[PDB]
């Protein structure tokens, strides 16, 4: 399992994606859905690792020196949207919702 939080470790923070507010009216439904993401530290463990970790944020903040706080379990969502041919499709779009957050 994983940990779920709101308001320290690799925890799940909820986030509602609004396609209206984003300005993507081409997707009819859902206008809004609870999506979530993963934030927090991933390993301690011992200790000579700290220089390699600290050096990572200096070179590339997008870089990972070890396990990352990434979603483990992801659920799909059913979506109604306009296609670039003037038609409206219903589709099962995979991995839209984050269900669990763990360390890689």
């Amino acid at each position, epitope marked *: 399992f994983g940990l779920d939080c709101d308001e320290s470790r690799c925890c799940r923070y909820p986030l509602t994606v609004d396609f*209206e507010a984003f*300005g993507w*009216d*081409w997707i*009819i*439904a*859902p*206008k809004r859905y609870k999506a979530n993401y993963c934030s927090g530290e991933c390993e301690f463990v011992f200790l000579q690792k700290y220089p390699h970790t600290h050096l990572v944020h200096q070179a590339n903040p997008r870089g990972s020196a070890g396990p990352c706080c990434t979603p483990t379990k992801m659920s799909p969502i*059913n979506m*109604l949207y*306009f296609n670039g041919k*003037e*038609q*409206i*499709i*219903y589709g*099962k779009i995979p991995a839209m919702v984050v269900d669990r957050c763990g360390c890689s």
Partner: antibody
Amino acid sequence: LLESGGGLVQPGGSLRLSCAASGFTFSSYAMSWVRQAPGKGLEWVSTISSGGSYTSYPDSVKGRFTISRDNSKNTLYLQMNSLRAEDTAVYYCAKQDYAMNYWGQGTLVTVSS
Amino acid sequence: IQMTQSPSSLSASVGDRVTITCKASQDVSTAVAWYQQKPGKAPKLLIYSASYRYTGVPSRFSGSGSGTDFTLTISSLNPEDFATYYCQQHYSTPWTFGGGTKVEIKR
């Protein structure tokens, strides 16, 4: 949702329907027009995106009808041009989500000579 | 692109369990919607995405299906349930509807 603008028109003629949205944020909701000929409907007429940029129509009304909206006026429009007798129906405006949730009472459009 | 509706009409009394089906000419996943229309009034949404009940819709109404064969189920008919019922397909445009099912009050 309140429709208005429907009455008698001659074939080959034009008519512009309007739909008054109130009690919700219209500019954030995708809209639809659906008709019912006396016996017995229902038929999809057109769908419009929340912003208005995207529109889809069936081959039965495509090229003749145009779904439009003015989010500042909280109104949905249907410009019906090159009208045929087969377009005689009660015209409903509705909110578009996965399906038409909340429909207006409608407006009857009669196309005859 | 068709949607064929089960018994065009049906007679029943209060409490009777009613089963209304709807068949699609092609595979339409779970993109089916059920509506309820009464004489002189605009239709009301019952079910969307084949099984999802809309807000306010009583628990006694329930949709089930996937692919081609879909069903609407009225567990225990109430006086206000006697109306016409329509199926639809929110799968791919043009969106096509069912013929309708008139639910008559038997006397």
